[PDB]
């Protein structure tokens, strides 16, 4: 018996090592570096949140079918990340209706810096628009982000503007 | 979770609640997505009406799936029902909801 | 050439059909000679006038 063969098994033993090394080492970067994006991403996930900034205006018709309009600004926290408005949904509720996400909004293709606003210009569509005394629901997705709701009901007065 | 409700008729009817992916997250397919749906502490029954039937997701979007309850499940003001959403390869949420006595329909709080 | 525990800055410019925006995923592998090869996947955030790429 001589360690001539020993040395041809060693070759072997080594070789598969330095594969297995060689592939786990890139298996654990990918790993690693997955484990990165994930890191990444979740902070991005709950820090991109945006927000919707103080009151909530819309013009309004007697004549006409009721709010049709709606006023209200929308920002990013100071610490926030960057946004895209293009991506952002506006999903609407006339007193317990159905939902419809909803189509014409005046910033439809704009970005928001951190710590900035804009004002965010929603219609409602044709029968969804609510009238004095309906509650509706608005619901801001940005893309990535926590979503808000915001919940009003026009007082049954108002003529129209600030939704206190 | 918003849904369509019904007083005349049987109760909620669609429900609509949208759906995402993480930013971070891979790319999924609805088509393989199961939807398991209970009306009260009643046995289960799998969903089979979605809108999306046949769309995919890329990471970091969102799609509106709508459900419809099977004709004995739908549920109506008062009675909780749960959601189970099943991805293929993925971890799988449940959102358990009841209905406030109440609710003429709209978004469920 | 890096000497172990050295470093340098690498500067890739993407070819003119895969330039990647805000909001689209890329992949980098990075493939030493005789080395255990890297990837780095990131999606540009859609936002992202530039900068960093957390």
């Given at each position: 018996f001589s360690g001539l063969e020993a040395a041809i098994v060693l070759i072997a033993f080594v070789?598969?090592?330095?594969?297995?090394?060689?592939?786990?080492?890139?298996?654990?970067?990918?790993?690693?570096?997955?484990?990165?994006?994930?890191?990444?991403?979740?902070?991005?996930?709950?820090?991109?949140?945006?927000?919707?900034?103080?009151?909530?205006?819309?013009?309004?018709?007697?004549?006409?079918?009721?709010?049709?309009?709606?006023?209200?600004?929308?920002?990013?926290?100071?610490?926030?990340?960057?946004?895209?408005?293009?991506?952002?949904?506006?999903?609407?509720?006339?007193?317990?209706?159905?939902?419809?996400?909803?189509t014409s909004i005046t910033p439809t293709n704009q970005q928001l810096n951190p710590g900035a606003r804009v004002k965010v210009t929603i219609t409602a569509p044709t029968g969804y628009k609510p009238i004095a005394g309906q509650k509706f629901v608005l619901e801001i997705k940005p893309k990535t982000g926590a979503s808000t709701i915001v919940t009003r009901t026009l007082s049954d007065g108002y003529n129209g503007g600030v939704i206190i």
């Amino acid at each position: 018996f001589s360690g001539l063969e020993a040395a041809i098994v060693l070759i072997a033993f080594v070789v598969v090592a330095a594969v297995f090394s060689y592939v786990m080492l890139g298996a654990g970067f990918f790993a690693t570096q997955k484990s990165q994006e994930v890191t990444y991403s979740g902070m991005k996930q709950a820090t991109s949140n945006l927000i919707l900034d103080g009151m909530i205006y819309g013009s309004y018709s007697k004549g006409g079918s009721g709010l049709a309009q709606l006023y209200f600004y929308v920002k990013v926290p100071e610490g926030g990340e960057t946004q895209d408005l293009k991506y952002v949904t506006y999903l609407w509720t006339k007193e317990n209706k159905a939902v419809t996400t909803l189509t014409s909004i005046t910033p439809t293709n704009q970005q928001l810096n951190p710590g900035a606003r804009v004002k965010v210009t929603i219609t409602a569509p044709t029968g969804y628009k609510p009238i004095a005394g309906q509650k509706f629901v608005l619901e801001i997705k940005p893309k990535t982000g926590a979503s808000t709701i915001v919940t009003r009901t026009l007082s049954d007065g108002y003529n129209g503007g600030v939704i206190i």
